Design a binder for this molecule. Sequence first.
Ligand SMILES: Nc1ncnc2c1ncn2[C@@H]1O[C@H](COP(=O)(O)OP(=O)(O)O)[C@@H](O)[C@H]1O
Ligand SMILES: Nc1ncnc2c1ncn2[C@@H]1O[C@H](COP(=O)(O)OP(=O)(O)O)[C@@H](O)[C@H]1O
Ligand SMILES: [Mg+2]
Ligand SMILES: [Mg+2]
Lengths: 50, 7, 7, 51, 370, 370
Amino acid sequence: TIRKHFPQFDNFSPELSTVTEAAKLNIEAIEQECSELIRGCQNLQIDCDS
Amino acid sequence: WXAXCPA
Amino acid sequence: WXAXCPA
Amino acid sequence: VRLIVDLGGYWNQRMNALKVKNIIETNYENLVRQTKLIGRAALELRDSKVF
Amino acid sequence: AALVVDNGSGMCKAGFAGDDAPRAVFPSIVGRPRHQGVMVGMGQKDSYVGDEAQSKRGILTLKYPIEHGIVTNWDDMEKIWHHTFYNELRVAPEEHPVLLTEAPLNPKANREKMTQIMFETFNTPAMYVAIQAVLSLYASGRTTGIVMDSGDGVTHTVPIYEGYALPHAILRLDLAGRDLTDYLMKILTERGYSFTTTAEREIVRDIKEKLCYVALDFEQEMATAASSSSLEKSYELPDGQVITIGNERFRCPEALFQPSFLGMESAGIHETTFNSIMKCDVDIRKDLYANTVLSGGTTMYPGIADRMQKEITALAPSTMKIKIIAPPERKYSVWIGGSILASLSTFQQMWISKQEYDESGPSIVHRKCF
Amino acid sequence: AALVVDNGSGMCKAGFAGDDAPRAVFPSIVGRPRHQGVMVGMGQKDSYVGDEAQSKRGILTLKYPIEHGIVTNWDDMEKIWHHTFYNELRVAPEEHPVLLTEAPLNPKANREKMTQIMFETFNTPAMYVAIQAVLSLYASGRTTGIVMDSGDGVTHTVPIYEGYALPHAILRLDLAGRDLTDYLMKILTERGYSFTTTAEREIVRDIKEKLCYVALDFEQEMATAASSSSLEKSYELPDGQVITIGNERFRCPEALFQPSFLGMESAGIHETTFNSIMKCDVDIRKDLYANTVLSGGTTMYPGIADRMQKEITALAPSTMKIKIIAPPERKYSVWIGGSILASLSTFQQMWISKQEYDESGPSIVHRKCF
Ligand SMILES: Nc1ncnc2c1ncn2[C@@H]1O[C@H](COP(=O)(O)OP(=O)(O)O)[C@@H](O)[C@H]1O
Ligand SMILES: Nc1ncnc2c1ncn2[C@@H]1O[C@H](COP(=O)(O)OP(=O)(O)O)[C@@H](O)[C@H]1O
Ligand SMILES: [Mg+2]
Ligand SMILES: [Mg+2]
């Protein structure tokens, strides 16, 4: 149906390629991994200073 | 080998 | 053959 | 004895300081790229009229 | 001093404890002359071992006594050991302990016979039996990591978190350089070059060691090779003929990651790394990702680490980081690590005594050595 | 006539309600050839499943669509069912209700997924889904008890009570037959036999089914096995090779009771049975001990019943009595119990109709059949 009357929707894969790459990425672990860095460095600030 | 491969 | 044998 | 027993008062804190610095020296640049990738995809899908 | 001998499928080395380089470097092949002796001027020995054979390899029937890390012919094996100790190392075995190395997941008969030979033929004062891959990690100065050993008969993956390795996650694959040698030749017949005998097999062995390389993108590189030129190299045969090789430079090393070309269902060398690390605990997984070590003469291909790092990256989740360690002298890491272990004072208590062997026979090796 | 179809990790069972034995018992495998076909005009199929796949398994890459209970491939799972109805049973599903089984603590994702592929692709008039563990004791003739369910994919311990499952008390242990078969091969290599590919994975599955058995006392049996050759047995490989195993008969099945042999921190089923019953109520605990049942092909080992009876007795208080019920037909107990359930006159009440599904949608299964 699309390839007969909707040429504009012929292939949406190339236009949306970042979504495919982001699918391999686990969101929740990314925030958990990075937010630990803020926790550790803030603990360093009190450790080095006081 | 004995049962399997050549060794 | 080119390398090895005569063929 | 000269290192662990002798300096056990502040050894872990010194080790705690060193581990993070090496971690920041390595993971920080790729974390920025990972964040920039996920936010771009969210904007791309929200701004896709074909989809 | 204690002697260190590391028997390999094709290449065997030996030296002394504390040394930074093995003393003897000669391949482990014994050949017998098929033709009949005509001249009586020289000795014309019944058999020749090591570098002696390769000098005259045209007229010998070269045989490999050890296959897939298993000593098939014990009669020939003692010929190497006798040659090592008296001709190359020129030392008497009955004064010094000697250590031997083995691949993991070997038959119990393999490593019981050598202990019998050591304590009955050469009468060595002491002995030890140590896994090939674990000693490689010692050479890198690490005790928490996974070692990618790849020689001629065995390609075993073992994770090592502490002073002892995990036996349960040991994955052993019988795909190595010798299979690769068998693979380029059948493909090399496409270009009109025929090599069938074992004498030309070493000639086949030479071209792999010099011209074969790992391609980062197999699909892109083969398309590049379709345009001809910029990749073909000229190699001179010992006869004198010069041969040119095209796409085969990367195709044969590529078979490590796609064993489908060689007809065995096991996954690629990149994939089996992922399987082994899945079998270990979650907490130890983080350390092993950043401590991946390559070893063995197969891993010498240029760019093998870069393509390896790319492949595991796709399979592994992006959170954990992958760092592949490729020391320049990983060719002899198995021996070098053994020299360090032999030089350790703590190891004087893990030697096996001749009297202890007498009381328990050759079965003591299972319980003591690992 | 209502169809009773038993999807399983290893074996797939199908038949008719009221029958005493499944009509079709074939492996749950899917095969795709790894080599190109050169002999044309044969009409060779693209995918092969069941006995026919097992017949030509040498040139096929067998895949299990279900691994660890969870279905990892929904496209292949219908194909074996498609072969199940039209080929094995030769019955049109358009005029018969069909019965399938579900696994304990199953994720909610699958449960409509089978629902959405049966009412649409095969449009079965009626449907019902129950626990395979619940149907286990139904064939045993009791309604309250605990089941020692073990199979090819996963193992579950379900303390049923009036046929109503206890979700909190369900304990999941990852010690299944496939693990033992994988453990059998890694220990079989000690005798010089190397089985690595998937086609020969069935071979060791055949060996352990005939030769492996449960030893009452591990420490006594290894001493006897080392001393004498009586325990050794000879098995015949399909190529004609003769193999012999000395102590592996009682060693591989022992890992079910000693998971540390595989390296799993979770302990054996003997304590897991005791662990699960600790979670239940104290007053009902009296009934559960005396109506313990064994199920699945993993529990077929000779001498397995008395061995578990001995071990849990030490775990259990001296006041309590333990009665291990091991019906010899427990291989097909899950299938037989379903045929019993389907044949019931009152079983027409909790049917899910094609019409009612249409207004209710996929979500009806979570509340109708639970
Ligand atoms: N420069 C090289 N490039 C590619 N492969 C090499 C190179 N040098 C050696 N090899 C391979 O390494 C193998 C032997 O490596 P090694 O593990 O040191 O000995 P062994 O396998 O006998 O233990 C040889 O079969 C050879 O094919
Ligand atoms: N006589 C036997 N001895 C040992 N194991 C057996 C025997 N018979 C069957 N098995 C094992 O039982 C398994 C069958 O699993 P099954 O109970 O069909 O799984 P499910 O419960 O998921 O249908 C097979 O994989 C096989 O290895
Ligand atoms: Mg080697
Ligand atoms: Mg089951």
